[PDB]
RNA sequence: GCCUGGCGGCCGUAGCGCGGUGGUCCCACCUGACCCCAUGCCGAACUCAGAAGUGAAACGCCGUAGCGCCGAUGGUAGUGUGGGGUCUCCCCAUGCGAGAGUAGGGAACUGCCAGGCA
RNA sequence: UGGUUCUCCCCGAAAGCUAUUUAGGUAGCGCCUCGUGAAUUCAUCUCCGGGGGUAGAGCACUGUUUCGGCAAGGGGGUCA
RNA sequence: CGUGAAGAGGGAAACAACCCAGACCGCCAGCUAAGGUCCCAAAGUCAUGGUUAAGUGGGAAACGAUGUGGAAGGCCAGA
RNA sequence: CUCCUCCUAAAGAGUAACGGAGGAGCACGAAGGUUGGCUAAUCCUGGUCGGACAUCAGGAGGUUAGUGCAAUGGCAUAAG
RNA sequence: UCGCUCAACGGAUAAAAGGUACUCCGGGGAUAACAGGCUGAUACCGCCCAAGAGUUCAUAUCGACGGCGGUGUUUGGCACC
């Protein structure tokens, strides 16, 4: 009655903290947010955060809900 | 629950001005007064501010807190920013409808010169 | 009535405290009060035949250690999961 | 025998049984039957030892079963091959670690309880000891 | 440095691939081969990674 | 230097309860809505006029640990590497080391205008 | 399917993935070899920056589970 | 992940996969690893302390049994 | 037998079995864009019919709701 | 831009079902039947607990509910020869 699964979507973090990225570089692929778009980072339609600017990757909890953001710092 | 509703409307318009990094002219309206500040792209502290609460713009007025008073602040906050060299400001409604006094204040800053 | 001899713990940790238990002692702690917590060692089968009383957990005790008696209350006891052996005692100042 | 009235899932994985138990104190009664070995208590065993305790105390004094059979053990029929999906759920066990209080009792004298917990221990596949309640 | 001496005590046959790389980074080719490495904490950590099979003097 | 207001930093040691408390300075309800405006109905809300009233509600500030929340020390769990004992599963050496729970902390702390004695 | 014939030296696999009228075949990649290029590229360890939700634990959530107190509501003889 | 495959050697009696260890060639040289040291069969009939009496060692469970460290109990006014 | 979601899956990615559970082969010219608002489920009480539940009003509660369609990640600046 | 349940979904053709105990060939212990092995769920044998039955009386005999083993005697599992 079972037997079906799907192809694995290769989600997760592609560039970790302190990594230097070019602009347009995908930083995290995700389904929901689970990671919000901080400075110099777009959200994308499937919520794929991506570097809007060259610089280093920066994760930080910030906000009234302790949500993880991702900034980009040149 | 008038303030709890209003900061809920502003806090989407307060963003896209932090993620844009735009100088915010923020307007605060109240029954009898009208306030305005110009705040830097950072969230830290203001650059110029003007209101009717200062006694300069108190008895230059027939009444504090109406649309002719909001146009008094509209010239006041704008003419005090250009002398500091601040234009290309972005207007923040701060939860008020851009209709009445706050329309009369942004209109009277666009005449006095604030680039939006 | 209950007077307990103790020695200061020189090494704390996991393998340190497993050696104390295999050598028929067991570790303890005296926290509470102004002073810093005092990691101590008791001998097992003298304290085990002393905590079988109901008033080891009720009255103030007296832990003598290197020339100091500290008026203490037993605060929490980690026992062995199934053997009748203690694994730790918490003492508070009193 | 004990069994969950409903579960969200019909079959579980096999899992493992590593570690020591979390409910290790006599919480409710006075006298306990603590497990000192490790294994699986099927609901047939828990019920057989529940009767053997109750019959020994002559329906007197309260009796707690501190464990519950909430793991569905499957078993493939005879003369069937390997594969063809997981087999069918045939009984329910409780995983038992060393230190688990299996049963509890009060309302009886202790020598009637140590007698009744000796009759229950011969129904279980797990070596067990008799423990009484401790303040702290 | 103080330049400690490290020698290999056991062999690297059944060992992890991360252990054999640590013997490469020290320079140990075989059992009994002593080697003369400087006393930095990055060599103390290489020793501690394979301390079951090296003997330092 | 307290008081209020905007904007923030920060994100429960900051929240909530409970108690006390503040007036035209500010803020709040409040007066009225005829028009700008607007409610699938209501000037409730939004909005516009203008201050007669009140600080009741809200909102600050001050109390109180009742509740969250924070939380060591030690021990335990787990575990990398190495070596051991054997149904399972552990133990030694060494490195890392929780969660829970105790002691205790805790009634937040902080960058612009205005007000009133300084 | 079976056989494949002289000698030394150097290196040295795989039995995976993905497709397949494919599953004992084959193909691309992975791993092997030889060659030619190129960067303190690579590995090890130390320090730093990271993201986890596994082990453990826990029971607020999702379910499940005992026992106690349930301010219930009312089965239940029961009254009319 | 390691070994075999594609790795011989020493040990586990014998025993691809386990333990030790990676064979270029020669030597009638030495030190070691795992394993061992009474004889087969190379090396301790080693030294000191303890244990066991079953040939346990040298196959096994629940369970049974006066095999052989800390306390507890009712007495030289008698247990 | 292709595709999606979860678990297996060992806290990066990936990872098998005739392993454990579910779904898809669309829908939508608004259910898309934007701009301006708004904030739920359940429960208590009040009670024209009206009952556990229609509607209205308050209190509690704080998303236990909702997300055109599975499940998971999300969602109050709402993605409702 | 359209036409494909080419769904066996990287799609052999536009178009395709069976029988063979009359059979054949090329291979396979890569893979079944027999027997051997491994394993013992099952089977068989023993034991523990004792509720009970046995007029009283658990253990003369039997032994519910449950527990732990042995054997390699069946039915299997596996697919090593």
Q: In CATH, what number is assigned to the domain containing residue D58?
A: 3.90.1170.10
Whether D13 is covered by a domain: the verdict is no
Residue nearest to nucleotide F57 (CA to C1'): B1
Residue B26, phi then psi, degrees to nearest 5 = -105, 140
* Ramachandran bin of C24, using left for φ above 0, alpha for ψ from -120 to 50, beta for the remaining angles: left
From the Cβ of B26, is strand F under 7 Å away? yes
Distance CA D85, CA C75 (A): 54
Please report which helix (H) or strand (E) contains residue A73, including its range.
Answer: strand A68-73
Distance CA E10, CA D128 (A): 46
The minimal CB distance from D136 to the residues C77, C81, C82 is found for C77
Distance CA C63, CA C38 (A): 11
Whether A26 is covered by a domain: the verdict is yes
E strand spans, chain C: 3-8, 25-31, 38-43, 61-65, 69-79, 86-93
User: What tokens were used for C51?
Assistant: 């905590």
**Cβ–Cβ contacts within 10 Å for residue D79, how many?**
5
> Least CA distance to D37: which residue of chain C?
C82
From the Cβ of E30, is strand H under 7 Å away? yes
DSSP state letter for D68: -
Concatenate the DSSP letters of all residues of chain E into one string. Answer: ----EEEE-S-SSS--HHHHHHHHHHT--STT-EEE----HHHHHHHHHTTTTEEE-
**Cβ–Cβ contacts within 10 Å for residue D53, how many?**
24
CA atoms C26, C32, C33, C35: torsion sign: positive
Nucleotides of strand J lying closer than 7 angstroms to a protein CB: 41-42, 48-51, 64-68, 75-79
User: Is the Cβ of D60 closer than 8 Å to some Cβ of chain C?
Assistant: no
CA A36 to each of CA A41, A43, A48, A61, B4: distance values in angstroms, whole numbers, following the listed order:
9, 8, 10, 10, 24
From the Cβ of B90, is strand F under 7 Å away? no
Host domain of residue B11: 1-116
Q: What's the distance, Cα to Cα, between the start and end of chain C in Å?
A: 15
Strands A49-51 and A41-42: antiparallel
Return the SS3 of B6: helix
Residue of D3, D22, D60, D27 whose CA lies nearest to D135 = D27
- The total number of structural domains in chain A stands at 1
Contacts of E40 (CB under 8 A, 6+ apart): E1
Contacts of C52 (CB under 8 A, 6+ apart): none
**CB E54, CB E26: distance < 8 Å:** yes
User: Is the Cβ of D127 closer than 8 Å to some Cβ of chain C?
Assistant: no
Distance CA C9, CA C17 (A): 9
Distance CA A15, CA C67 (A): 59
Return the SS3 of B32: coil
CB < 7 A to strand I: residues 36-65, chain A: 36, 47
Q: Any idea which nucleotide's C1' is nearest the CA of E30?
A: H22
> Could you give the strand order of the β-sheet that contains E54-56, starting from the edge strand earlier in sequence?
E34-36, E5-8, E54-56
Return the SS3 of C35: coil
Q: What's the distance, Cα to Cα, between the start and end of chain E in Å?
A: 14
Return the SS3 of B19: coil
- C50: which chain D residues are within 8 Å (Cβ-Cβ)? none
Strands D88-96 and D39-42: antiparallel
CA of D82 to C1' of J49 (A): 37
Residue of B86, B75, B90, B80 whose CA lies nearest to B16 = B90
Instruction: Report CB contact under 8 Å: D20, C54.
Output: no
CA of D3 to C1' of G78 (A): 37
- The total number of structural domains in chain B stands at 1
User: Is the Cβ of D136 closer than 8 Å to some Cβ of chain C?
Assistant: yes
Contacts of D46 (CB under 8 A, 6+ apart): D1, D2, D65, D67, D69, D94
**Cβ–Cβ contacts within 10 Å for residue A33, how many?**
14
Whether A2 is covered by a domain: the verdict is no
CB < 7 A to strand H: residues 104-133, chain D: 121-122, 127
Kindly provide the resolution of this structure in angstroms, with one decimal.
2.6
Residue of E55, B16, D121 whose CA lies nearest to D130 = D121
Please report which helix (H) or strand (E) contains residue C19, including its range.
Answer: helix C14-22
E strand spans, chain D: 31-35, 39-42, 62-65, 71-75, 88-96, 101-106, 128-132
The residue whose two tokens read 């009720």 is C58
Query: For A35, how many CA atoms within 13 A lie in the half-sphere containing its CB?
Result: 27
Please report which helix (H) or strand (E) contains residue D112, including its range.
Answer: helix D110-121
- C77: which chain D residues are within 8 Å (Cβ-Cβ)? 134, 136
3-state SS string for A4-71: CCCCCCCCEECCCCCCEECCCCEEEECCCCCCEECCCEECCCCCCEEECCCEEEEEEECCCCCCEEEE
Residue D65, phi then psi, degrees to nearest 5 = -100, 110
Instruction: Report CB contact under 8 Å: D136, C81.
Output: no
User: Is the Cβ of D134 closer than 8 Å to some Cβ of chain C?
Assistant: yes
Instruction: Report CB contact under 8 Å: C82, D135.
Output: no
DSSP state letter for B57: G
Return the SS3 of D124: coil
User: What tokens were used for E28?
Assistant: 């140990």
Instruction: Report CB contact under 8 Å: C74, D129.
Output: no
**CB E12, CB E20: distance < 8 Å:** yes
Give D36 to chain C, closest Cα distance, Å: 6
CA atoms E44, E46, E48, E51: torsion sign: negative
- The total number of structural domains in chain E stands at 1
User: Is the Cβ of D66 closer than 8 Å to some Cβ of chain C?
Assistant: no
Whether A4 is covered by a domain: the verdict is no
Host domain of residue E39: 1-57
User: Is the Cβ of D78 closer than 8 Å to some Cβ of chain C?
Assistant: no
Host domain of residue D37: 21-136
Distance CA C62, CA A26 (A): 65
Establish whether chain B is in contact with chain C, requiring a minimum of 3 CB pairs below 8 angstroms. Answer: no
Strands C25-31 and C38-43: antiparallel
Q: State the best of C81, C86, C88 to mutate against chain D, taking most chain D CBs within 10 Å.
A: C81
Host domain of residue A31: 11-74
DSSP state letter for C90: E
- The total number of structural domains in chain D stands at 1
């Amino acid at each position: 009655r079972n037997g079906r699964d799907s192809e694995a979507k290769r989600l997760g973090v592609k560039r970790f903290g302190g990594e230097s990225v070019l602009a347009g570089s995908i930083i995290v692929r995700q389904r929901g947010t689970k990671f919000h778009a901080g400075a110099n980072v777009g959200c994308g339609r499937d919520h794929t955060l991506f570097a809007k600017a060259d610089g280093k990757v920066k994760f930080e909890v910030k906000g009234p809900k302790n949500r993880k953001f991702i900034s980009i710092e040149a | 629950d008038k303030k709890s509703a209003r900061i809920r409307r502003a806090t989407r318009a307060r963003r896209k001005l932090q993620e844009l990094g735009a100088t915010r002219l923020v307007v605060h309206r109240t029954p009898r007064h009208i306030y305005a500040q110009v705040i830097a792209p950072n969230g830290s502290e203001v650059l110029v501010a003007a209101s009717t609460v200062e006694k300069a713009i108190a008895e230059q007025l027939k009444y504090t807190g109406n649309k002719d008073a909001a146009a008094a602040v509209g010239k006041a906050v704008a003419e005090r920013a250009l002398e500091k060299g601040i234009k290309d400001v972005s207007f923040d409604r701060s939860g008020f409808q851009y209709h009445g006094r706050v329309q009369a204040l942004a209109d009277a800053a666009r005449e006095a010169g604030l680039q939006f | 009535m209950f007077t307990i001899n103790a020695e200061v713990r020189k090494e704390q940790g996991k393998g340190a405290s497993r050696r104390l238990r295999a050598a028929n002692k067991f570790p303890a702690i005296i926290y509470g009060g102004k002073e810093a917590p005092l990691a101590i060692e008791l001998d097992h089968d003298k304290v085990m035949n002393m905590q079988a009383k109901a008033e080891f957990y009720s009255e103030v005790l007296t832990i003598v250690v290197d020339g100091k008696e500290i008026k203490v209350k037993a605060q929490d006891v980690q026992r062995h999961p199934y053997k009748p052996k203690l694994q730790h005692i918490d003492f508070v100042r009193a | 025998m004990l069994q969950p009235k409903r579960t969200k899932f019909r079959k579980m994985h096999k899992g493992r049984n590593r570690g020591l138990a979390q409910g290790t104190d006599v919480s409710f009664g006075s006298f306990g039957l603590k497990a000192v070995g490790r294994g699986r208590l099927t609901a047939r065993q828990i019920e057989a030892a529940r009767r053997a305790m109750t019959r020994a105390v002559k329906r007197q004094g309260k009796i707690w079963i501190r464990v519950f059979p909430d793991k569905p053990i499957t078993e493939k029929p005879l003369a069937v091959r390997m594969g063809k999906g997981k087999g069918n759920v045939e009984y329910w066990v409780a995983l038992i670690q060393p230190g688990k209080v299996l049963y509890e009792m009060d309302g009886v004298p202790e020598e009637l309880a140590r007698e009744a917990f000796k009759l229950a221990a011969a129904k279980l596949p797990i070596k067990t000891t008799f423990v009484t309640k401790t303040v702290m | 440095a103080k330049t400690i001496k490290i020698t290999q005590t056991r062999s690297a046959i059944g060992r992890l691939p991360k252990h054999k790389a640590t013997l490469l980074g020290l320079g140990l080719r075989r059992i009994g081969h002593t080697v003369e490495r400087e006393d930095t904490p990055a060599i103390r950590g290489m020793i501690n990674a394979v301390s079951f099979m090296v003997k330092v003097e």
